[PDB]
Symmetry: none
Subunit: 116 residues, 2 copies
């Protein structure tokens, strides 16, 4: 029940992504990133947000994950210029993936949560 939430955020090209929308999405991400995985931190920039995988560790028995994902889902529904894809994968299953290219391979081997 330890699972990685793999989110792929991208700019879909059908609308300009505004400063407020980049800020909001980087804020949502950074409310879950702690001092121990600073490497998942986001900036409100194209380079940080457009075309990037982030894999967050979640224990699904807790309502954290489900709350995190609903913020994401509702935000992506509010923002036509940003697509968000999300997959859950068992952590036990994830730790044994190749170190290089890992997040894409987890997303192809994972359960589709949503796809906005």
């Amino acid at each position: 029940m330890f699972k990685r939430a793999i989110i792929f955020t991208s700019f879909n090209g059908f609308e300009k992504v505004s400063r407020t929308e980049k800020r909001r999405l980087a804020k949502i991400i950074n409310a879950r990133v702690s001092i121990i995985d600073e490497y998942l931190r986001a900036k409100d920039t194209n380079a940080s947000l457009d075309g990037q995988y982030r894999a967050f560790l979640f224990n699904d028995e807790s309502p954290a994950m489900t709350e995190f994902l609903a913020k994401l889902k509702a935000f992506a529904e509010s923002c036509t210029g940003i697509s968000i894809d999300a997959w859950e994968i068992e952590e036990s299953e994830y730790v044994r993936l190749p170190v290089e290219r890992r997040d894409f391979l987890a997303a192809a081997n994972g359960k589709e949560i949503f796809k906005i």
Copy 2:
């Protein structure tokens, strides 16, 4: 072989910039500011760092320009509150630019390196 690295540092407004972050960026900049070039020297203040161009002379036969650009990029990536744009221009082209707004014009006429 002689080039200028043009850098534009700014506080992007996503996050507060701490004093230690200001000092760390000033220290990275000042590693390439000798005692002769006091005009380039970075202070740990908004006036000195927030919204300022600086143009560093380099000889591209040395790896010094690349290691400094690497240290800058790494800093900007880990500090959510600071943006750094970097361009490169030929020294012969840099000295035939008008003196006023030269670094601005050099950035305009320059080859883009990163925007983090």
